[PDB]
């Protein structure tokens, strides 16, 4: 019924405070109101930017100019990656820390990179595993090094990518 995240722009900030004019003594004088409005409306801008200072620092929306700072703390350097996929690698490596490389587990990680039906996985008798891609939205060669990391120590892997079925 209520949002748990209380960090939001204050609703109707301006009309508040004006509500504290005692008994409409000054209201309708058009000389005191403008003086008060001009000062209060400055806080509006500062109040608004208080959110982006917290909202924009999250990894989901962080821009490349500062996303590097988030990656730097985790040891994931930009190298030659671009912004749209640099976000992906950060997620992939971080998620690897609570993984076991099971068949059900592997499907889950690939799920975040290719939608619901964009990926499928065949399995083979002698350590063979196969990955199929149908709806890639980013160039895969630069993402490939991580795709190896979350697999068992002895996996034998093939990678094939195509658009659609």
């Amino acid at each position: 019924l209520k949002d748990v995240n209380h960090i939001h722009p204050l609703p109707d900030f301006v009309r508040g405070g004006f509500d504290y004019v005692p008994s409409d003594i000054f209201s309708g004088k058009e000389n005191f109101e403008q003086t008060l409005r001009i000062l209060l409306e400055r806080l509006e801008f500062i109040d608004q930017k208080m959110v982006e200072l917290a909202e924009l620092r999250t990894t989901l929306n962080a821009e490349d100019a500062i996303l590097d700072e988030i990656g730097r703390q985790l040891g994931i350097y930009r190298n030659g990656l671009n912004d749209p996929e640099y976000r992906a690698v950060i997620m992939i490596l971080t998620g690897n820390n609570s993984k076991s490389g099971t068949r059900a587990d592997i499907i889950a990680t690939l799920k975040q990179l290719f939608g619901e039906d964009g990926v499928t996985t065949y399995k083979g008798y002698n350590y063979r595993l196969d990955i199929n891609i149908f709806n890639t939205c980013m160039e895969v060669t630069d993402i490939l090094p991580e795709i190896i990391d979350m697999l068992p120590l002895v996996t034998h892997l093939r990678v094939v990518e195509n658009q659609g079925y």
Partner: protein
């Protein structure tokens, strides 16, 4: 719009500007013919409110800077790396061998009674370790921790946290049908470590590898729960020597220590069977001290005991079972 977080950084408006548009907009509501010059009653009022408002911008900038890695100091440093799930150490105690007390009952080891810094010489032990300072605290944060298993990062993470005395580790993989260039049998992988025990790492490895003993290495040690054995290797086996030549203003004596110790970190941090790049070594010297102190720089590398003629400037690597190491009594400074 040019104020606050902007992706390229954080921008803070100075005191003067905030007054400028405040007066401008304030003037717009009453026309030009409105006194706002110095010492005027209206101007005096404006200054008070803007100064109170200005602190808000300064506070925001401090908060952002306080949470960045570069600006982390004191307690604020603890919070930032605390977000990663690790905390600084405390008063640590010495360990000895048969002020002090026995660590456990004995029959046919040694633990310090005092809480911290500390009767520590041969034929009369780990000393010091009072408080874990920020510099090494930043270093200790370089590691990683995870609960994963059966994957390459998982193996590395577990070993560095459980195996006592471990200092470095690397893994080589041969996931193909035919023996690799390193002679690894097909569908097997090798683990090489530096330091640590032999009948303990095997125990740790057993709990974290998949249910398919694909290990291979020089030495083995059987374990049971059914019996099997685990393989591994040990490398050690190298010490280096360095010389540096430069042109300019001599570096007294203190700087050489700052330069010398700084180099030891970069060389030491190299991976097992890694490679050293002459360019990287130069870069460290340009960064361990203030710029604008040298016009030319060169570094020469040779193994201990070799003749002086053996100095070379080309990049150097190490074999599979070799680990690069550097120490003092090294780093010969000279002016060209």
């Amino acid at each position: 719009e040019n104020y606050g977080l902007t992706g390229s950084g954080f921008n803070l408006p100075p005191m003067d500007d905030l007054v400028q548009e405040t007066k401008k907009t304030f003037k717009s509501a009453f026309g030009e013919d409105f006194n706002t010059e110095s010492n005027s009653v209206a101007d005096k009022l404006i200054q008070i409110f803007n100064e109170r408002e200005y602190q808000l911008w300064l506070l925001m900038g401090s908060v952002y800077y306080a949470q960045t890695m570069q600006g982390a100091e004191g307690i604020y440093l603890d919070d930032l790396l605390g977000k990663r799930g690790i905390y600084r150490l405390g008063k640590t105690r010495s360990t000895g061998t048969v002020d002090y007390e026995l660590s456990s009952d004995v029959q046919v080891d040694v633990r310090s009674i005092e809480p911290g810094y500390i009767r520590d010489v041969h034929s009369v032990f780990i000393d010091g370790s009072d408080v874990e300072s920020d510099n090494e605290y930043r270093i200790r944060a370089a590691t990683s921790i995870s609960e994963g298993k059966a994957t390459r990062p998982a193996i590395l993470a577990a070993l560095l946290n459980k195996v006592e005395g471990i200092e470095k580790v690397r893994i080589f993989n041969n996931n193909t049908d035919k023996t690799n260039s390193l002679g690894i049998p097909p569908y097997r992988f090798m683990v090489v470590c530096y330091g640590g025990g032999t009948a303990e790492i095997s125990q740790v490895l057993y709990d974290t590898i998949a249910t398919s003993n694909n290990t291979y290495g020089d030495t083995f040690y059987d374990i049971t729960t059914q019996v099997e054995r685990i393989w591994h290797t040990k490398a050690a086996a190298r010490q280096l020597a360095i010389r540096v030549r430069y042109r300019g203003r001599p570096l007294s004596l203190t700087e050489e220590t700052a330069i010398a110790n700084g180099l030891a970190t970069a060389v030491n941090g190299t991976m097992i069977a890694g490679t050293l790049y002459n360019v990287r070594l130069v870069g460290t010297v340009m960064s361990s001290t203030s710029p604008d102190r040298f016009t030319q720089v060169y570094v020469d590398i040779k193994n201990k005991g070799q003749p002086d003629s053996a100095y070379v400037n080309t990049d150097v690597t190490a074999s599979t079972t070799q680990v690069l190491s550097l120490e003092l009594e090294d780093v010969i400074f000279s002016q060209i």
